[PDB]
Amino acid sequence: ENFSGGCVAGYMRTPDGRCKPTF
């Protein structure tokens, strides 16, 4: 899977434990 980020391509994971929804 994607280990070069954390979430989906349009979701940049944050240390908030959230994914940044950029679409």
From Swiss-Prot:
It comes from the Eukaryota. Changing residue 16 to E/L/N: Abolishes mitogenic activity and reduces plasmatocyte spreading activity. Disulfide bonds join 7-19. Transmembrane segments: none annotated. Changing residue 6 to F: Significantly reduces plasmatocyte spreading activity. This is Growth-blocking peptide, short form.
